[PDB]
Amino acid sequence: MENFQKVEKIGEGTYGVVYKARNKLTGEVVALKKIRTEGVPSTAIREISLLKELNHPNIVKLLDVIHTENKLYLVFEFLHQDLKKFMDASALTGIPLPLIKSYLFQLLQGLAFCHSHRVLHRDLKPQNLLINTEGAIKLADFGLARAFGVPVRTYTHEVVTLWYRAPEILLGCKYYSTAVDIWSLGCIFAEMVTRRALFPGDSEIDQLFRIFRTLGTPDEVVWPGVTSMPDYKPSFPKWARQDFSKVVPPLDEDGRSLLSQMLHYDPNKRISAKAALAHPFFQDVTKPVPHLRL
Numbered sequence: 258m259e260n261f262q263k264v265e266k267i268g269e270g271t272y273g274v275v276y277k278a279r280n281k282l283t284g285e286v287v288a289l290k291k292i293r294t295e296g297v298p299s300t301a302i303r304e305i306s307l308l309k310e311l312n313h314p315n316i317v318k319l320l321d322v323i324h325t326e327n328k329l330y331l332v333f334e335f336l337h338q339d340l341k342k343f344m345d346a347s348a349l350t351g352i353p354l355p356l357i358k359s360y361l362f363q364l365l366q367g368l369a370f371c372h373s374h375r376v377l378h379r380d381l382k383p384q385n386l387l388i389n390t391e392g393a394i395k396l397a398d399f400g401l402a403r404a405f406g407v408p409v410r411t412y413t414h415e416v417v418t419l420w421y422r423a424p425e426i427l428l429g430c431k432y433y434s435t436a437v438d439i440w441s442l443g444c445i446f447a448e449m450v451t452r453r454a455l456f457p458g459d460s461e462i463d464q465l466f467r468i469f470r471t472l473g474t475p476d477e478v479v480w481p482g483v484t485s486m487p488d489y490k491p492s493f494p495k496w497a498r499q500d501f502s503k504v505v506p507p508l509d510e511d512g513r514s515l516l517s518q519m520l521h522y523d524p525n526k527r528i529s530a531k532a533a534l535a536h537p538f539f540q541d542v543t544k545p546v547p548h549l550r551l
């Protein structure tokens with residue numbers, strides 16, 4: 258659009274490509290997400306438009322929902338770096354625990370906020386978590402899955418990230434809950450700590466089995482109703498559960514306890530964002546300044 262002097266493409270998401278752009282007139286720098294065709298659901302436009310009203314320090318502000326020329330663009334406030342890039346940049350030394358704690362605490366505040374407003378993310382991953390020089394971290398692209406639905410393949414063909422998908426989704430549950438976001442965040446927490454993805458599945462079944470090999474194959478005792486899930490198969494191998502001390506070393510017991518509650522199989526037992534904020538792990542939380550190289 259001629260309203261911008263486009264700076265560059267900065268990444269690609271499940272629901273569309275993201276660009277950095279500068280308003281030729283206002284000079285404002287923003288993130289522009291181009292949503293990908295038939296007739297563009299009218300239901301979704303109003304739903305996504307309602308997200309412009311969300312205001313929280315830990316949620317990337319949705320400035321505008323542009324529906325012109327029969328195209329859909331989301332205009333977001335711009336942050337300079339995503340968590341995936343920061344984790345890669347911090348891979349040699351690791352992100353200091355106080356910063357990991359600060360980021361997790363903030364992310365839980367953002368999730369607690371969205372969930373209380375009946376907004377789910379459903380596709381949380383390091384790539385859509387953004388950070389700034391002031392130590393803040395924010396979640397972007399909330400409520401897109403509920404509004405549009407869910408693709409399967411990108412026009413550019415990009416290996417969809419299954420690494421952060423909750424088990425109930427992988428087992429074919431049709432009715433997601435806020436618990437799926439807690440699961441994704443738990444996976445991200447683990448990754449910040451170990452500097453390695455927790456469950457790096459290559460396929461949907463490999464993703465599920467990686468979860469099973471670590472947390473044990475779920476059964477009716479730990480997850481009532483699991484054997485009746487749409488894609489559950491009695492033929493699934495039965496793996497014994499591992500110890501978290503082996504999963505996220507050298508995280509302390511407060512952190513392991515919190516992570517274990519975020520990774521409960523049963524969405525109904527999985528800790529809520531609000532309850533997580535009260536966990537002892539956050540007793541000494543602070544807000545450190547990250548070492549950001551832009």
Ligand SMILES: Nc1nc(N)nc(-c2ccccc2O)n1
Pocket residue numbers: 267268269275288317333334335336337338339384387397398
């Ligand atoms: N890959 C990526 N990189 C930066 N620096 N920002 C974003 C971004 C994505 C959505 C909303 C706001 C944003 O800054 N996305």
